[PDB]
Amino acid sequence: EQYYGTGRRKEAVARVFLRPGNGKVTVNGQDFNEYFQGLVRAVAALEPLRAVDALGRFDAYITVRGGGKSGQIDAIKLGIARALVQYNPDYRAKLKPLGFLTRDARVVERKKYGKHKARRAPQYS
Amino acid sequence: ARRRRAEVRQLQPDLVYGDVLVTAFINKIMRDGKKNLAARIFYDACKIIQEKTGQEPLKVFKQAVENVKPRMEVRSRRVGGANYQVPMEVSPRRQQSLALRWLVQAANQRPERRAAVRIAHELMDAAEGKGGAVKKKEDVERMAEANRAYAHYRW
Amino acid sequence: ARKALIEKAKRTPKFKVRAYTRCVRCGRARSVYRFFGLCRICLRELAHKGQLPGVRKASW
Amino acid sequence: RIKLRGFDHKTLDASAQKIVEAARRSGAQVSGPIPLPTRVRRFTVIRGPFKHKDSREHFELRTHNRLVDILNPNRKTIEQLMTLDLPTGVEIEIKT
Amino acid sequence: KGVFVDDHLLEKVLELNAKGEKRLIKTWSRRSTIVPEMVGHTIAVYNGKQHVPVYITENMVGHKLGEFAPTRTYRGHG
Amino acid sequence: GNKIHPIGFRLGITRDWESRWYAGKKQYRHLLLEDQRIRGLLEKELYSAGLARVDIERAADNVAVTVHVAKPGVVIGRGGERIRVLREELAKLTGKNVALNVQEVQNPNLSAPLVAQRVAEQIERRFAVRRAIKQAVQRVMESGAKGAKVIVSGRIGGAEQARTEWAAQGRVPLHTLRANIDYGFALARTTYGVLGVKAYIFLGEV
Amino acid sequence: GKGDRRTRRGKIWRGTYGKYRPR
RNA sequence: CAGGCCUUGACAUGCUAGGGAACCCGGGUGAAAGCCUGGGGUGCCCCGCGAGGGGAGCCCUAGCACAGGUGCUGCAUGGCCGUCGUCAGCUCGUGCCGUGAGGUGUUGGGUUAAGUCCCGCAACGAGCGCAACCCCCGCCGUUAGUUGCCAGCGGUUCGGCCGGGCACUCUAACGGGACUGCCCGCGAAAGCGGGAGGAAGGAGGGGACGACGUCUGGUCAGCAUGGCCCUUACGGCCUGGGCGACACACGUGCUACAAUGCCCACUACAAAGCGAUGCCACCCGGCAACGGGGAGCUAAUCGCAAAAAGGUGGGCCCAGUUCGGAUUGGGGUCUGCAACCCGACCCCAUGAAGCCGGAAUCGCUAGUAAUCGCGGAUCAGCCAUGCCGCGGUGAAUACG
């Protein structure tokens, strides 16, 4: 019925269900275009659908929790690049060579005692 | 990079035209990280390359880059006890950064009301031979060659 | 004025604003951690000896 | 609802498989070990006695919560778990 | 609602103005508010070192005690 | 100053706490306030005996008051005499059900705080201090040791110029977490000032 | 901005409400 | 610091003479302190019906032996921290060269972040140091489900609400995994370039850890500590002041000088934590601060709580301005005995400088800088723009 992909990228959680068909997209109970309005990074995690030509092989149901607007986006990018290699384990071809797999450990750093914002050191004489 | 060659990062394409040089101008239009505001101002002004002088927002940008990219520059070096500005060919990577940057500066300084309004205008005029970044490109270039007296004072 | 002082924190006087956190093994007035009852340098040397119940040195 | 509090987890996770293992042998039917998000209290301290704000250090208080439920209660269940193996540093809780 | 005057001074005050208006009440209460009975007297208020007297008038009724005998000595710089 | 306390480093890496119990917001300071109170009575009138650590446990008015020690008799006496009048003086302030305990130290020449307050007592005794550090270290390797390290700090012998005396035969890799090293500190107050004394016994890996 | 109390940005930075930022 | 008090003292141990004890309430005064003073009446081990007693808690007075001192000395100190410096060092053992200081090793050729390893060698070993084991993060699993969940069905008053379920998400414990281990390239070896598979490769990101030592570094004011010195005062209590003074001088910072902006409506998406004489849901009253009423939580289930930016679409139109929030006047609230000196929060009005800064200088290499909001501690309240954290948007560049 579905195809499932676990997505995260920097304190974000994006649960995807590549339920086949037309290509309509809902996250958290609304069209992808309603939620993600304004955003130009918002077109998007539907790009893994552009690495296996399947804009017209899948509608989408997604749940998402954490981080922010464009930080959630990169989660569904791991959530749509995983829900396609699950459907066709022969589709990681043109997915990891196209770099849509993996999961970026690019996390915001612990603020350091002394440096005003992790590294932005105090001004001295 | 006393040690290494200092890694050159590739950029993303831009979802709208899939161009790694369109992300490179929008990053230099950026301010305070607010990239969502950085991106409108292109397509706000790309629309201004389309409304005014009906053409190709893809191609007026890519010309305005080659119309501000400086092939010869001069950096000052210390010899004897002298401050000689050395004639050198500015590398292609230096060019990109050099082209885009003057392009934001010259545009920001413009006497027009909205940000993109300037951005477009400048891009148009750069390809047309007459911009603010276009003066600056010739300034550096003829600042060089005026200084070819220091050509073997080049590394 | 110091010891007769630490006595003065032990005896609540004329008002309820007028009380403060002095200290126990320290006679220390400032940087008093009330959860621990300990005065920043009281706290730290006993945290290293381990005389503080399950109080780890962090690292993350 | 046998809400097991504590500081040390390795001592706390030996007795929450103890009232897990032993009530199952003594009734039914033991909710397996559930781990609550540990509530952390930190202490950042100027290492030196005097001034030296530039140099400090980090100490934390990890008090990890643990809940466990008894499904079909029974007698002998609260008398097998009336007298329980300690340890010196674990907190109990009884409900239903 | 709320107005504060110590009440060791307003005790004398409503005992002094009552029992024959004199003046010259010395006190260590600049925290008090100069209630309108104090009008026309002489309170010697303590700024810390000195008991500066004040001749109480109408021109300052809802006013406090310690503004009226300042603690610091200025005169100038140079 | 630039070094970390080799113990507080290992509190859950090698060694372990000495009030190993649980509490929270309501009552944390008061059982802990008691602990130091316990340690004041027990570090005084349990000196001339040994005493290297105090492991303390709590329940619900059950404070366990366990002593590590070099010589147990000086806690219990004869028949059971002292360990009971110690379980009469302590269970007064502690307000609860005490339990004054004893566990004998397998060679007090591998216990470091023992290695310490011995060698520092030898400072207030006005001995060859230098030769004592070479001595007390020497003894500890002589009785099963992978390494040791002692440091004496202050008016060494009394001399006005404040020195730092130092000795360490055998490996002590303080930078390691699985290093197991016992450490203690001895405070020799003298005819002329206070001398610092340290202790560092590499006991083996883990 | 964040120092002009009599507005929205002024209360927020500050940690306050009233008219120009209410609850 | 000023004024007013107390002398064995605010605190400790002990001995001695008289009371006598505990303990609770006044009276008078005084700014408070303190001073003087009117009540009740002690279990107990006790000859004892008794008069009455012995002794002992706890108290007073007197008199000591003493206290107390943030007074001086951080070159008489401990301890702890700062610092060079995460820098790649600094040493021993024996052997050997040298009359000796000392050297040799540790130097040299090759390579790492590194005394990183490899090879050479009158050297061969060895320690403290780097690394490793520890934490955090990033991939996957086991264990576990009152936090998640139409992913699954039914019902859904339509709030995951009920059932119902652990697959998820999440939680938090134990595990797995990277090893230049596999190939290609070169190299005597180590090792470098490049490839694949891989969630991540070449210390994957950060933390913690910082050598013998140096700076007669810093703290006697956290604490202790040798000594000097003060013992109706250098002790101590108290009321009030000062620590917040202002002709000026420098450091760290906050908010700006606007339109990539401000303003107003409305609409989304975090994380870390903290919550009982606490967090305060929700109504009512107030332009509001707040003020009532009042529900729930020992807290992954109640609460702080709003994130902000952003997005939508309207206001402003280049104006010292709807830029910027200083200053002052007035009316207010809350904490608190008490906001004159000296508190924050609110409402109205006043709306100064400032149109981006001379000479000079600081920070930062990737999720960093920039920008944005949130917590916490200490704290009644608060002068936090500080500090310690948390995450949101997210770059620039590196020939050398």
Swiss-Prot record, chain A:
HAMAP family, A to Z: Ribosomal_uS9_B
Quaternary structure and partners: Part of the 30S ribosomal subunit. Contacts proteins S7 and S10.
Domain of life, source organism: Bacteria
Cited InterPro entries: Ribosomal_Su5_D2-typ_SF, Ribosomal_uS9, Ribosomal_uS9_bac/plastid, Ribosomal_uS9_CS, Ribsml_uS5_D2-typ_fold_subgr
Biological processes per GO annotation: translation
GO cellular component, one term: cytosolic small ribosomal subunit
Family the entry assigns: Belongs to the universal ribosomal protein uS9 family.
Keywords per UniProt: Ribonucleoprotein, Ribosomal protein, RNA-binding, rRNA-binding, tRNA-binding
Keyword Lipoprotein: no
Entry's Gene Ontology molecular function annotations: rRNA binding; structural constituent of ribosome; tRNA binding
High-level lineage: Bacteria, Thermotogati, Deinococcota, Deinococci, Thermales
Annotated protein name in UniProt: Small ribosomal subunit protein uS9
Its job: Part of the top of the head of the 30S subunit. The C-terminal region penetrates the head emerging in the P-site where it contacts tRNA.
A Pfam family: Ribosomal_S9
UniProtKB/Swiss-Prot annotation, chain B:
Keywords recorded for this protein, A-Z: Ribonucleoprotein, Ribosomal protein, RNA-binding, rRNA-binding, tRNA-binding
Keyword field contains RNA-binding: yes
GO cellular component: small ribosomal subunit
Pfam families linked: Ribosomal_S7 (PF00177)
Gene Ontology biological-process entries: translation
Gene3D superfamilies named in the record: Ribosomal protein S7 domain
GO MF annotations, alphabetized: rRNA binding; structural constituent of ribosome; tRNA binding
Annotated function: One of the primary rRNA binding proteins, it binds directly to 3'-end of the 16S rRNA where it nucleates assembly of the head domain of the 30S subunit. Is located at the subunit interface close to the decoding center. Binds mRNA and the E site tRNA blocking its exit path in the ribosome. This blockage implies that this section of the ribosome must be able to move to release the deacetylated tRNA.
Quaternary assembly: Part of the 30S ribosomal subunit. Contacts proteins S9 and S11. Binds to the C-terminus of IF3 and to the C-terminus of Era.
Family: Belongs to the universal ribosomal protein uS7 family.
The name this protein goes by in its record: Small ribosomal subunit protein uS7
Naturally occurring in which organism (per UniProt): Thermus thermophilus (strain ATCC 27634 / DSM 579 / HB8)
The gene coding this protein: rpsG
From Swiss-Prot, chain C:
Cofactor, free-text remark: Binds 1 zinc ion per subunit.
Keywords on record: Metal-binding, Ribonucleoprotein, Ribosomal protein, RNA-binding, rRNA-binding, Zinc
SUPFAM superfamilies documented for this protein: Glucocorticoid receptor-like (DNA-binding domain)
Record-level GO BP terms: translation
One Gene Ontology MF term: rRNA binding
This protein's GO CC annotations: cytoplasm; small ribosomal subunit
Transmembrane regions listed in the UniProt entry: none
UniProt cross-references to PANTHER family, sorted A to Z: 30S RIBOSOMAL PROTEIN S14, SMALL RIBOSOMAL SUBUNIT PROTEIN US14M
General function of this protein: Required for the assembly of 30S particles and may also be responsible for determining the conformation of the 16S rRNA at the A site. Binds 16S rRNA in center of the 30S subunit head.
Protein family according to the UniProt entry: Belongs to the universal ribosomal protein uS14 family. Zinc-binding uS14 subfamily.
Matching HAMAP family: Ribosomal_uS14_2_B
Protein name in UniProt: Small ribosomal subunit protein uS14
Gene name for this UniProt entry: rpsZ
Curated annotation (Swiss-Prot), chain D:
Molecular function (Gene Ontology), one example: structural constituent of ribosome
Name under which the protein is recorded: Small ribosomal subunit protein uS10
TM segment ranges: none
Gene Ontology CC terms, in alphabetical order: ribonucleoprotein complex; ribosome
Gene for this chain: rpsJ
GO biological process, one term: translation
SUPFAM superfamilies hit by this protein: Ribosomal protein S10
Subunit structure: Part of the 30S ribosomal subunit. Forms a tight complex with proteins S3 and S14. Also contacts protein S9.
UniProt cross-references to PANTHER family, sorted A to Z: 30S RIBOSOMAL PROTEIN S10 FAMILY MEMBER
Keyword Coiled coil found: no
Keyword RNA-binding: yes
Family of the protein in this entry: Belongs to the universal ribosomal protein uS10 family.
Annotated keywords: Ribonucleoprotein, Ribosomal protein, RNA-binding, rRNA-binding
Role this protein plays: Involved in the binding of tRNA to the ribosomes. Part of the top of the 30S subunit head.
